[PDB]
Amino acid sequence: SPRTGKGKWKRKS
Amino acid sequence: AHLYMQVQIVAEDQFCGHQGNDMYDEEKVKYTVFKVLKNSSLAEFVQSLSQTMGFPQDQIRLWPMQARSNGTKRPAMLADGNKTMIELSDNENPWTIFLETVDPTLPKFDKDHDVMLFLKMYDPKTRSLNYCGHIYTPISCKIRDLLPVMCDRAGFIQDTSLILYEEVKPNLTERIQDYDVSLDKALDELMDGDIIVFQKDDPENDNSELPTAKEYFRDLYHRVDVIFCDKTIPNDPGFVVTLSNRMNYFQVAKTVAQRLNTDPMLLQFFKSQGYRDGPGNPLRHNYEGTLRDLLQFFKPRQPKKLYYQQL
């Protein structure tokens, strides 16, 4: 049900 | 001293001809490079940039190259412009920036309603990508509304049937199925620097080795170069063979045999033995795994190598 995401957000330093 | 940072400007001409994922090859690319004070201003850099590349500040826009959690790197939006450069880069050094320029001022970009999208056309006949530039589009725009611009930039007749994919990341090329929804509905986590890859929908595609862009990117993702060294020849530099990670034993054996003009049954392969020099354990021809399974003891950087002997 909840979103796992495609990792398109900004990478951590 | 260490109060300086390197800023690397990439132009659109570097996106042309790129056959890989993302906009260009991070490992091989032309940059205009600037040595800049970490505590200098954006507005300073912009003027210093304007003066240097023969463009008034109104005709240029900076899109910093931003690393995403999934490993891709894409132009991202950058009102702000009095923060320090080292703060804007968030301590990245070097900092790479895509420089958009006009060509006979830039159209306005609304940070809240538009998105900057990049386009690629895939040609199954030649198995190549063709960079089709970028567009400002309202997020609320339907996919169907993007088709004429794609047809236009690829040189296709108007109303040519297209197949559209989002290039999300290596080995993830997702087909857009419903052309009549807004962009944010079509693309999960819609962002600036997203890529749509499109191709002609023609039955002639299926004769191609790589009939769709998905197939293309899948092949590229699994492509691997392996050194093969003759066990019985001491300090053999060996030769390089281009393979696929999902090959079984038979496909490897046959490919290496065509390289050597011999029969695959006259070839005995040996595993890597890793950091140690020389062949390890023999590879049996009933091996049930893939080339990837054989090379998994190698890191992505470590040069892949296998040993063989002629029988």
UniProtKB/Swiss-Prot annotation, chain A:
Q: Which cysteines are joined by disulfide bonds?
A: none
Q: In what way is this protein post-translationally modified?
A: Phosphorylation at Ser-1 by CDK1 during M phase impairs interaction with USP7, preventing deubiquitination and leading to degradation by the proteasome.
| UniProt note on tissues of expression | Expressed in thymus, bone marrow, testis, lung and heart. Overexpressed in breast cancer.
Specify the superkingdom: Eukaryota
The record's subcellular location field reads: Nucleus
- Outline the inducing conditions: Up-regulated in proliferating cells, and down-regulated in quiescent cells. Down-regulated upon adriamycin-induced DNA damage, in a p53/TP53 and CDKN1A-dependent way. Induced by E2F1 transcription factor.
Sites where Phosphoserine occurs are at 1, 13
Supply the domain comment. The tudor-like regions specifically recognize and bind histone H3 unmethylated at 'Arg-2' (H3R2me0), while the PHD-type zinc finger specifically recognizes and binds histone H3 trimethylated at 'Lys-9' (H3K9me3). The tudor-like regions simultaneously recognizes H3K9me3 through a conserved aromatic cage in the first tudor-like subdomain and unmodified H3K4 (H3K4me0) within a groove between the tandem subdomains.
Disease field = Defects in UHRF1 may be a cause of cancers. Overexpressed in many different forms of human cancers, including bladder, breast, cervical, colorectal and prostate cancers, as well as pancreatic adenocarcinomas, rhabdomyosarcomas and gliomas. Plays an important role in the correlation of histone modification and gene silencing in cancer progression. Expression is associated with a poor prognosis in patients with various cancers, suggesting that it participates in cancer progression.
Its annotated function is as follows: Multidomain protein that acts as a key epigenetic regulator by bridging DNA methylation and chromatin modification. Specifically recognizes and binds hemimethylated DNA at replication forks via its YDG domain and recruits DNMT1 methyltransferase to ensure faithful propagation of the DNA methylation patterns through DNA replication.
Q: How does it assemble?
A: Interacts with DNMT3A and DNMT3B. Interacts with DNMT1; the interaction is direct. Interacts with USP7; leading to its deubiquitination. Interacts with histone H3. Interacts with HDAC1, but not with HDAC2. Interacts with BLTP3A. Interacts with PML. Interacts with EHMT2. Binds hemimethylated CpG containing oligonucleotides. Interacts with ZNF263; recruited to the SIX3 promoter along with other proteins involved in chromatin modification and transcriptional corepression where it contributes to transcriptional repression. Interacts with UHRF2. Interacts with FANCD2.
> Which named protein is this?
E3 ubiquitin-protein ligase UHRF1
UniProtKB/Swiss-Prot annotation, chain B:
Q: What induces it?
A: Up-regulated in regulatory T-cells (Treg). Down-regulated during neural progenitor cell differentiation.
Q: Which residues carry this modification: N6-acetyllysine?
A: 299
Q: Where is this cross-link: Glycyl lysine isopeptide (Lys-Gly) (interchain with G-Cter in SUMO2)?
A: 299
Q: Write out the ranges of the annotated region (Interaction with ICP0/VMW110).
A: 62-231
Cross-linked residues, Glycyl lysine isopeptide (Lys-Gly) (interchain with G-Cter in ubiquitin): 299
Where's it found, cell-wise?
Nucleus; Cytoplasm; Nucleus, PML body; Chromosome
The post-translation modification note in this UniProt entry reads:
Isoform 1: Phosphorylated. Isoform 2: Not phosphorylated.
- Organs and tissues of expression: Expressed in neural progenitor cells (at protein level). Widely expressed. Overexpressed in prostate cancer.
Associated disorder, per UniProt? Hao-Fountain syndrome: An autosomal dominant neurodevelopmental disorder characterized by global developmental delay, varying degrees of intellectual disability, autism spectrum disorder, poor or absent speech, and mild facial dysmorphism. Most patients develop seizures. Additional variable features include hypotonia, hypogonadism in males, and ocular anomalies.
**Any notes on this protein's domains?**
The C-terminus plays a role in its oligomerization.
Function according to Swiss-Prot or TrEMBL: Hydrolase that deubiquitinates target proteins such as ARMC5, FOXO4, DEPTOR, KAT5, p53/TP53, MDM2, ERCC6, DNMT1, UHRF1, PTEN, KMT2E/MLL5 and DAXX. Together with DAXX, prevents MDM2 self-ubiquitination and enhances the E3 ligase activity of MDM2 towards p53/TP53, thereby promoting p53/TP53 ubiquitination and proteasomal degradation. Deubiquitinates p53/TP53, preventing degradation of p53/TP53, and enhances p53/TP53-dependent transcription regulation, cell growth repression and apoptosis. (Microbial infection) Contributes to the overall stabilization and trans-activation capability of the herpesvirus 1 trans-acting transcriptional protein ICP0/VMW110 during HSV-1 infection.
How does this protein assemble?
Monomer. Homodimer. Part of a complex with DAXX, MDM2, RASSF1 and USP7. Part of a complex with DAXX, MDM2 and USP7. Interacts with MDM2; the interaction is independent of p53/TP53. Interacts with DAXX; the interaction is direct and independent of MDM2 and p53/TP53. Component of a complex composed of KMT2E/MLL5 (isoform 3), OGT (isoform 1) and USP7; the complex stabilizes KMT2E/MLL5, preventing KMT2E/MLL5 ubiquitination and proteasomal-mediated degradation. Interacts (via MATH domain) with KMT2E/MLL5 isoform 3. Interacts with OGT isoform 1. (Microbial infection) Isoform 1 and isoform 2 interact with herpesvirus 1 trans-acting transcriptional protein ICP0/VMW110. Binding to ICP0/VMW110 may modulate the substrate specificity or activity of USP7 to stabilize viral proteins.
> Which family would the database say this protein is a member of?
Belongs to the peptidase C19 family.
Protein name in UniProt: Ubiquitin carboxyl-terminal hydrolase 7
